[PDB]
Amino acid sequence: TELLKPRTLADLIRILHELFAGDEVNVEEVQAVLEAYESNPAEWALYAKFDQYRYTRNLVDQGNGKFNLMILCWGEGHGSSIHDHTDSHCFLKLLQGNLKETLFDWPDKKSNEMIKKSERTLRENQCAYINDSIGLHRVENVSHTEPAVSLQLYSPPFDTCHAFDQRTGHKNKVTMTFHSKFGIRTP
Ligand SMILES: [Fe+2]
C-alpha cells in the first residue's frame, strides 16, 4: 500500500509486481500508478512493433502469472472488435496518440443491434479501466495521421475474449495471440 512515481517503465514493472503479490488487487492503486508513469518512447520503443493491417499485441512482462503487461500498436484506422475481458481487470494507458473507447451494453439474447452507451477519447498518459461488469468496449485509433501506442495490463491473464457482431449481438470466441514477446517477434 505504498505507491511512488515510477521513474521508468522498468521501475513501473517492479511496482506492479509489488502490487500483485497477493491474491486480491486494489484497482485504484494499479490505475493511479499507470497514470503516474510519464510515457518515455526510448524505454518502450523495443515493444512498439507495428503491423500495417491491424493492431498488434506485444507482451512486455508476464507478472509471475498474475497479470499480462503488453503494449498495443494501433495503425491509424485500426480498431478492435467489441469484446469482453474474460472476467478480468483491464487497464489501458495511452503512451502515444489517441484512442476512442466506445462502451456498449451486454446485449440481450434477442438478435437486436447493440447501441453505444457512451464514448470517450483517451489522450496521452491517461489510464482507463474496464471490466466485464462495466460493459463491452471497442477501442479505435481514428486518427488518419498519427499511430497510437497503449500500455495494457490484464489480471488474471487470459488468452480468449469474445467478439460481438454489432448488428446482431452474436458473440464469437476469439483467441488472443502475440505479435512479439519481450521484444522478440513471434509468428
Ligand atoms: Fe479491451
132 Cα: distance to centroid of ligand 1 (angstroms):
10
Architecture field, domain 1-187:
Sandwich (2.60)
Among residues 58, 86, 60, the alpha carbon closest in space to that of 72 is found at 58
Q: Can you give the C-alpha Rg of the chain in angstroms? A: 16
Instruction: Say if residue 17 carries a ligand binding annotation.
Output: no
What kind of experiment solved this structure?
Answer: X-ray
124 beta partners: none
For residue 168, what is its C-alpha cell?
446482431
- This PDB structure is determined at a resolution in Å of 2.8
Tell me how far apart the alpha carbons of residues 187 and 118 are, in angstroms, rounded to a whole number. Answer: 36
Instruction: Say if residue 89 carries a ligand binding annotation.
Output: no
| Sequence-ordered list of residues with C-beta below 8 angstroms from that of 54, at least 6 positions apart, any chain | 75, 78
Is residue 79 exposed (0-12), middle (13-18) or buried (19+ Cβ within 10 Å)?
middle
Residues 169, 114 contacting (CB under 8 angstroms)? yes
Q: Are strands 89-96 and 184-185 parallel, antiparallel or unpaired?
A: unpaired
The C-alpha torsion from 130 through 163 and 86 to 116, rounded to 10°, is: 30
